[PDB]
Design a protein around this ligand. Structure first.
Ligand SMILES: [Mg+2]
Ligand SMILES: [Mg+2]
Ligand SMILES: [Mg+2]
Ligand SMILES: [Mg+2]
Ligand SMILES: [Mg+2]
Ligand SMILES: [Mg+2]
Ligand SMILES: [Mg+2]
Ligand SMILES: [Mg+2]
Ligand SMILES: [Mg+2]
Ligand SMILES: [Mg+2]
Ligand SMILES: [Mg+2]
Ligand SMILES: [Mg+2]
Ligand SMILES: [Mg+2]
Ligand SMILES: [Mg+2]
Ligand SMILES: [Mg+2]
Ligand SMILES: [Mg+2]
Ligand SMILES: [Mg+2]
Ligand SMILES: [Mg+2]
Ligand SMILES: [Mg+2]
Ligand SMILES: [Mg+2]
Ligand SMILES: [Mg+2]
Ligand SMILES: [Mg+2]
Ligand SMILES: [Mg+2]
Ligand SMILES: [Mg+2]
Ligand SMILES: [Mg+2]
Ligand SMILES: [Mg+2]
Ligand SMILES: [Mg+2]
Ligand SMILES: [Mg+2]
Ligand SMILES: [Mg+2]
Ligand SMILES: [Mg+2]
Ligand SMILES: [Mg+2]
Ligand SMILES: [Mg+2]
Ligand SMILES: [Mg+2]
Ligand SMILES: [Mg+2]
Ligand SMILES: [Mg+2]
Ligand SMILES: [Mg+2]
Ligand SMILES: [Mg+2]
Ligand SMILES: [Mg+2]
Ligand SMILES: [Mg+2]
Ligand SMILES: [Mg+2]
Ligand SMILES: [Mg+2]
Ligand SMILES: [Mg+2]
Ligand SMILES: [Mg+2]
Ligand SMILES: [Zn+2]
Lengths: 119, 132, 146, 161, 62
RNA sequence: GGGCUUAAGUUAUCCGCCGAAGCUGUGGCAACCUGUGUGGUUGGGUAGGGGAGCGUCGUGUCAGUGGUGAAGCUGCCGGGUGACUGUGUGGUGGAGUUGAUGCGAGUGAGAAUGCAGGCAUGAGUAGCGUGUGACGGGUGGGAAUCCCGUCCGCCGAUUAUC
RNA sequence: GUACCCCGGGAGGGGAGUGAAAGAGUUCCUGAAACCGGUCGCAUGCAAGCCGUCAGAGCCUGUGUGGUGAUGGCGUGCCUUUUGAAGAAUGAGCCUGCGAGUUAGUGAUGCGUGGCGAGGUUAACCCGUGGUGGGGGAGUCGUAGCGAAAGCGAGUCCGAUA
């Protein structure tokens, strides 16, 4: 029972060439070269799906820092004040408030100022 | 599943628009050397193109000129158009059959030689289609 | 979805800083922050949201210690023996704009966007600047307590 | 089924070129398996697939296959099919009167039961057997079995407690 | 020396696109009876003449 | 690194914060243990051991299906934890082949300076094998490179003749 | 097996005919990939790029999802072989096809599973010209071990009936 490889073989090649359908040069034309980049692409995507948490937290923290420093309060004192006041609104909602509802963010800044240890 | 509106060169290149075309298959010259003149002749008026190609120094001018003349004649016969209001709407060169030959070299070696060939296609439409 | 600025959505302003007796390091950090717009809640690394900074009196920038004659600045033309060196005091006396731009660029990220943003820094060694039309507002370098 | 190994492919006796100096890979024969036109490495060779199944297993299987459709009431017994001379029309009837058309017939009489054998030979939905050749495959494939009287008698006589 | 690596498509095309020719310009024959296109400063292949509408000296017997 | 002593240096001390795929929260999957209502523990991994599968070809049987268009090829829209896939929807194509359950394998390729073919790269690049040709006319769709003629040059112990 | 007509010296094409189909036109079924081009959309001439990935404006499209991608972050190929390779260690220009754990023994030894069970099983061969079924117990393994062996035997051997 001789078996010809082509019908079964082309499936993974079509899959990989589809996955590599925006790459430059040989990486989008040649299966072997596309295969190497798809390994790197998968590794990068896995790494970046976990680094995305930190990237977005850093962005939120920077925006909160800017918005609170506009009110004469540093980010660390602002966060400690919120923690002491017991308001568990997170970095994300706080950044969205800073960009969108600056008055609500400033009210939270006042809450943190009042909840400061003052020591 | 095969049926009607079967594909055709006229349908692909013109698609119910007025005009005609001509193909020179198996031109015994290189596709790149033909493209060197096709790039110049593309987009011109047909009479200006043929008159210029009578003077173009490259050897590719002659086959391309004959193709343009044939396309002009086809248009004049099958659509009533006149030669003086046609312009070369499209023009391209594809690759045809290549022959492998051998050139003997020093120390008993043999070097490959590729005798290439080209297909030339020219599509001519009335000049009114230029701004359409 | 986190907010992201859209091209010209963030309006860029013009500040002017009098470098009179202000330490070069503080001036450069403040300028970099303003140029990149880190004081704005609309900040985004990939979109220029910063402001234009006009620095005046750059020839009177304060330096501590013996920096004015021992803190050196180097350039290389890319060919053997193509190094030139000049002290920061001489550079502030001669071409203060170059000194301030070097400090700010060193403190600013190494980006195409950072190169674009550094053009927004207009440094003049004297007390007068030609950008009255842009109407720069005075900016005071301050600190936030605790 | 058979293939030619690198030793059986024609030619390929000499080393194609020198081991070193040519810039080509080291080759030992033009009929090496990685060559086009070379020998097959582990291709098929002629063999027998017969298995030495124990007698008790083979017989018991036959008994179980027969017993399943004995309990399902798919065994009929006829004195014979066809009378005098032999047609296929007659037995087609006898069997259609029995039931359906995925059939097995037993006539055992290995030498001179030509009437029944040649009658049912050409149905193409009937399998005809001698009682001494029942075999499990055919019993399982059959949807019903019809024994001739002699067929059933001879099978029982050949194997009985 | 020998090419160390296969040149990329972008670089190969960057270099290859500069292998081209300019179109021959052609000028209308000054002879009113000819009106054909010929090379500048060259006798008209059709009328075989040269010069302005006046002069018009024969150059090629064609 | 910029820059920093007007510490952004050293040191003691206090108050905050940042910070990992660690921990916690939430949702899904899996292995194992346990009395079997719960729950607990665990799931980086090369050589390598164990377990369970996908896809290709042939084939027994049953159910089928196919010019109202099989295989193959090629789009789109989807699906699964993976190999992969749709009983979605087109195009091309023209004669086969699907599902269930067994059986048998020439059953899976990216590497062997692997083999065969096709085709790129270098590149319109190097070369076109010692040299003297010029012109008039002819032929022709097309002529430096064919024919004829006239000038001129070359060989001549050979570029001759046998 | 393309009459006839047109451009062409031809080659080739354009009409038309034949045919169910001619993009089945003889280089002729199907016609993949590398490779070479035309057209359209977006990006791209201040930029340092293992070519991706995450974030993300704008444009195009909206067949309201897709194409493209300014700009920011992070990020040193594949295989082999190595204490250790992105390695300036090896192999690979590219695609397509091919190319390596097979088979045979009433072999050796496990396991899963099925049959029979103090029993199990046949080999050659014979019959079935009708096969995959029946016969065939010659043998062979289990049924007692211990000893060089005679031998003795739930014992035996060394030993002195220790
Ligand atoms: Mg910060
Ligand atoms: Mg289909
Ligand atoms: Mg020789
Ligand atoms: Mg041999
Ligand atoms: Mg040998
Ligand atoms: Mg062979
Ligand atoms: Mg370059
Ligand atoms: Mg985390
Ligand atoms: Mg964890
Ligand atoms: Mg958790
Ligand atoms: Mg694991
Ligand atoms: Mg773990
Ligand atoms: Mg392993
Ligand atoms: Mg039917
Ligand atoms: Mg098939
Ligand atoms: Mg099956
Ligand atoms: Mg194989
Ligand atoms: Mg391959
Ligand atoms: Mg080599
Ligand atoms: Mg080859
Ligand atoms: Mg080339
Ligand atoms: Mg050149
Ligand atoms: Mg070169
Ligand atoms: Mg050169
Ligand atoms: Mg040359
Ligand atoms: Mg010569
Ligand atoms: Mg010559
Ligand atoms: Mg002569
Ligand atoms: Mg002489
Ligand atoms: Mg003499
Ligand atoms: Mg039909
Ligand atoms: Mg077709
Ligand atoms: Mg072909
Ligand atoms: Mg074909
Ligand atoms: Mg630019
Ligand atoms: Mg760098
Ligand atoms: Mg070593
Ligand atoms: Mg290497
Ligand atoms: Mg290298
Ligand atoms: Mg080595
Ligand atoms: Mg190599
Ligand atoms: Mg290879
Ligand atoms: Mg015996
Ligand atoms: Zn003229």
């Amino acid at each position: 029972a001789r078996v010809k490889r082509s019908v079964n073989a082309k499936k993974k090649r079509r899959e990989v060439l589809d996955q590599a359908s925006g790459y430059r040069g040989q990486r989008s034309r040649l299966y072997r070269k596309a295969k190497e980049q798809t390994l790197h692409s998968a590794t990068y995507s896995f790494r970046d799906r976990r680094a995305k948490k930190g990237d977005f937290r850093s962005l939120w923290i920077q925006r909160i820092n800017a918005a609170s420093r506009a009110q004469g309060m540093t980010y660390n004192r602002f966060i400690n004040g919120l923690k002491n006041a017991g308001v568990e609104v997170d970095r994300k909602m706080l950044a969205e408030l800073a960009v969108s509802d600056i008055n609500a963010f400033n009210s939270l800044v006042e809450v943190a100022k009042a909840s400061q240890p003052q020591n | 599943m095969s049926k009607t509106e079967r594909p055709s060169r006229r349908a692909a290149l013109l698609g119910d628009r007025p005009g005609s075309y001509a193909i020179a298959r198996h031109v015994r010259m290189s596709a790149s050397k033909c493209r060197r003149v096709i790039n110049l002749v593309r987009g011109m008026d047909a009479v200006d193109a043929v008159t210029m190609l009578k003077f173009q120094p490259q050897a590719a001018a002659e086959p391309i000129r004959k193709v343009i003349a044939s396309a002009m004649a086809n248009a004049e016969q099958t659509e009533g158009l006149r030669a003086d209001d046609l312009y070369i709407s499209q023009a391209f060169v594809d690759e045809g059959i290549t022959m492998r030959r051998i050139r003997p070299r020093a120390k008993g070696s043999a070097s490959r030689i590729l005798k290439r060939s080209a297909h030339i296609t020219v599509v001519v439409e009335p000049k009114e289609a230029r701004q359409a | 979805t986190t907010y992201s600025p859209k091209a010209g959505e963030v309006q860029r302003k013009w500040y002017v800083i009098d470098a009179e007796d202000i330490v070069l390091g503080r001036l450069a950090t403040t300028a970099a922050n303003l140029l990149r717009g880190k004081h704005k809640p609309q900040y985004a690394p990939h979109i220029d949201t910063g402001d234009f900074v006009v620095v005046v009196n750059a020839s009177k920038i304060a330096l501590t210690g013996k920096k004015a004659t021992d803190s050196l600045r180097y350039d290389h033309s890319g060919r053997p023996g193509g190094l030139r060196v000049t002290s920061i005091g001489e550079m502030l006396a001669k071409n203060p704009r170059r000194a301030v731009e070097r400090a700010v660029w060193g403190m600013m990220p190494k980006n195409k966007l950072s190169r674009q943003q550094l053009k927004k820094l207009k440094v003049y060694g004297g007390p007068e600047h030609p950008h009255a039309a842009q109407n720069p507002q005075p900016y005071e370098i301050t600190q936030i307590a605790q | 089924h058979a293939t030619k190994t690198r030793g059986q492919v024609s030619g390929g006796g000499k080393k194609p070129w020198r081991q070193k100096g040519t810039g080509r890979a080291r080759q030992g024969s033009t009929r090496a398996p990685q060559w086009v036109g070379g020998g097959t490495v582990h291709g098929p060779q002629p063999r027998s697939y017969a298995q030495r199944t124990p007698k008790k297993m083979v017989g018991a299987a036959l008994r179980g296959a027969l017993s399943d459709m004995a309990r399902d009431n798919r065994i009929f017994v006829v004195t014979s099919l066809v009378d005098g001379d032999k047609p296929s029309t007659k037995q087609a009837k006898a069997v259609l009167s029995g039931l359906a058309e995925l059939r097995k017939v037993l006539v055992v009489l290995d030498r001179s039961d030509e009437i029944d054998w040649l009658s049912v030979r050409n149905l193409s939905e009937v399998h005809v057997l001698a009682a001494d050749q029942l075999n499990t495959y055919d019993v399982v494939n059959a949807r019903t079995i019809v024994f001739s009287q002699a067929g059933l008698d001879a099978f029982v006589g050949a194997r009985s407690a | 020396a020998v090419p160390k690596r296969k040149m990329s498509r972008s670089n190969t095309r960057h270099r290859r696109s500069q292998w081209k020719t300019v179109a021959t310009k052609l000028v209308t024959c000054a002879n009113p009876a000819c009106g054909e296109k010929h090379l500048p400063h060259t006798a008209c292949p059709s009328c075989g003449g040269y010069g302005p509408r006046g002069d018009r000296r024969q150059v090629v017997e064609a």
